Every structure is written in structure tokens, then in C-alpha cells.
Amino acid sequence: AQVINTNSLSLLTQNNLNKSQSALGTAIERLSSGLRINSAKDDAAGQAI
Amino acid sequence: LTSARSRIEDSDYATEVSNMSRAQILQQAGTSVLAQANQVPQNVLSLLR
Amino acid sequence: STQMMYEQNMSGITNSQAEWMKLGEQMSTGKRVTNPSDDPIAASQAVVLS
Amino acid sequence: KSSSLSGSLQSFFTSLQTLVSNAEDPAARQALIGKAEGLVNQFKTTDQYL
Numbered sequence: 001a002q003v004i005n006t007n008s009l010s011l012l013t014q015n016n017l018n019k020s021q022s023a024l025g026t027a028i029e030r031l032s033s034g035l036r037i038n039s040a041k042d043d044a045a046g047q048a049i
Numbered sequence: 050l051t052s053a054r055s056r057i058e059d060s061d062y063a064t065e066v067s068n069m070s071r072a073q074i075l076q077q078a079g080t081s082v083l084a085q086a087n088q089v090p091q092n093v094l095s096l097l098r
Numbered sequence: 099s100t101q102m103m104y105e106q107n108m109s110g111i112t113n114s115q116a117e118w119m120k121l122g123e124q125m126s127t128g129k130r131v132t133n134p135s136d137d138p139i140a141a142s143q144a145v146v147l148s
Numbered sequence: 149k150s151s152s153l154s155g156s157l158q159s160f161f162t163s164l165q166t167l168v169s170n171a172e173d174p175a176a177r178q179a180l181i182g183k184a185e186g187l188v189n190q191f192k193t194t195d196q197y198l
Contacts, residue, residue: 005075005128010067017063075128082125089118145154 153194156187 029038040047124130134141149155160183167176 004130005071007067007071014063014067079126082122086122086126089115145149148149148154148158 153187153190156183156190159183160187 030036037043037047123132131137131140160180163176163180163183167173167180170176
């Protein structure tokens with residue numbers, strides 16, 4: 001209950017913050033560029049094509 | 050290069066804020082406990098009035 | 099004879115106060131256990147986990 | 149655990165790994181030597197007081 005030294009719940013929260021941040025960054029980059037494919041990371045074979 | 054350097058240098062505010070909170074509570078609770086600890090031998094004196 | 103109550107009482111007092119010292123250790127330090135003498139199994143697993 | 153070697157040993161290896169990715173970096177080499185020398189003290193400390 002009164003956990004010691006470790007607020008496990010806060011740790012758990014941090015991960016969801018990370019996930020949302022990653023999605024937002026992707027969306028902003030795509031929105032700015034005007035391209036769904038800013039690098040081979042987005043869509044490799046499609047990038048080549 | 051800017052991104053790469055940042056991942057080495059910068060601090061994540063969430064992590065350090067959480068650490069700060071942990072340390073704050075630890076300090077407060079510990080000081081109260083210490084007060085009681087010092088009062089202990091004074092209770093032994095309470096045997097010895 | 100005479101001493102008996104005092105010997106019983108000092109025994110009880112020492113048990114209680116030793117336990118209190120340990121408890122304060124347990125609150126102050128911020129962890130269930132310090133030494134392998136206490137829960138050696140947990141100590142080994144904590145090392146392995148580290 | 150701070151009164152124990154395990155902290156240094158695992159830090160030693162963590163440093164070692166980092167060399168395995170920057171083989172041409174003198175600074176990482178120096179840090180590895182530093183970990184090693186710090187670890188020499190600890191072992192000789194425990195032996196010394198044994």
C-alpha cells in the first residue's frame with residue numbers, strides 16, 4: 001500500500017506519455033513535409049517505388 | 050547531430066520531477082522519525098525520574 | 099526471589115526496544131531488509147535482479 | 149550493496165559494453181581503466197579486513 005522508494009504507478013504512466021509523444025511527432029513531421037514518407041523508416045518498399 | 054547529442058545530454062522533466070517528489074517525502078518522513086528516535090532515550094529517562 | 103519481576107520486565111523491555119530499533123531502521127532506510135542474516139533468499143534474488 | 153562489490157562489477161561490465169561500440173574512442177578506454185582501478189580497492193578492502 002504505502003509502497004516504499006518506488007511509485008510504480010508513476011513509472012507506468014511515463015510509458016504512455018512516451019507513446020503519445022512518438023505519435024504526435026510522427027504526425028507533425030508528416031503534416032509539415034506534405035509527404036507520408038519522410039524517410040525509408042515510414043514505408044521502405046514504397047519509398048523505393 | 051542535434052538529435053543525437055540531445056539524447057545524450059538532456060534530462061526528461063518527468064523523471065526528475067518524480068525523483069524530486071520521492072526525495073521530498075523521504076526527507077520529511079525521515080526527519081519526523083528521527084525526532085521520535087531521539088525522544089526514545091528520553092523515555093528511558095522517564096523510567097529514571 | 100525478588101529479582102524475578104525485574105528480570106522478566108527487562109527481558110520484555112529489551113525485546114520491544116530491539117524490535118523498535120529494527121522497525122525504525124525499516125522506516126528510515128526505506129526498505130524491508132538490510133542484511134542477508136534477515137532474508138538471505140531475498141538478498142540473493144535482489145543481487146541477481148540488479 | 150554499496151558496501152559490496154556487485155555495484156562495481158556490474159558497472160565495470162556496463163562500461164565494458166560501451167567500449168564494444170566505440171572501439172576507437174580513447175576516453176572510453178580511460179573510463180574502463182578507472183572502473184578497474186576502483187574495483188581493485190574494493191576487493192583488497194574486503195580481503196584486508198578479513
